[PDB]
Amino acid sequence: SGAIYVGNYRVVNRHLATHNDWANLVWEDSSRDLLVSSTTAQGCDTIARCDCQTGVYYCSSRRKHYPVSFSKPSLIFVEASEYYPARYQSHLMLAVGHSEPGDCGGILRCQHGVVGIVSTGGNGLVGFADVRDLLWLDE
Ligand SMILES: CSc1ccccc1N1C[C@@H](C(N)=O)CCC1=O
Numbered sequence: 001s002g003a004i005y006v007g008n009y010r011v012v013n014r015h016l017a018t019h020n021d022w023a024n025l026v027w028e029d030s031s032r033d034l035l036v037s038s039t040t041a042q043g044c045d046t047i048a049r050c051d052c053q054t055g056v057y058y059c060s061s062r063r064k065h066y067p068v069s070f071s072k073p074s075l076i077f078v079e080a081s082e083y084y085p086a087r088y089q090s091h092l093m094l095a096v097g098h099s100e101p102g103d104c105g106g107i108l109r110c111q112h113g114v115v116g117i118v119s120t121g122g123n124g125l126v127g128f129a130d131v132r133d134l135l136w137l138d139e
């Protein structure tokens, strides 16, 4: 689990969105595994606006943060699960690291701010949904 809070927005993994997230829907993209809902309270997370390929992510299944190198956002094939059939997921970044289903929502951060959230895993890899292109999150 985990979310990003910036301004009057809440960014969550689309497969983990609640009834309240859907009742206050701003934007959702199944191909990205992202959903953004509106909030009454003001969030103060800083979104990164950069092309970094190094950062640190939080891994709940180890209660630890790990430094990782990660690929640029791209269209990557993701094995079927109970939330989605086998498909290509867009705007995804991969790194060598540990990730279990419950790790979804862990934040990846660089020196500039939040880069994305854990969205895929298995085989010794960890995949992050990028949010750096969603410039509207800051306005
Ligand atoms: C670390 S997430 C993971 C790990 C192992 C096996 C499956 C997953 N996924 C991948 C997710 C997706 N974005 O398609 C769907 C939900 C899920 O549990």
Ligand SMILES: [Zn+2]
Pocket: 048, 049, 050, 051, 052, 110, 111, 112, 113
């Ligand atoms: Zn950066």
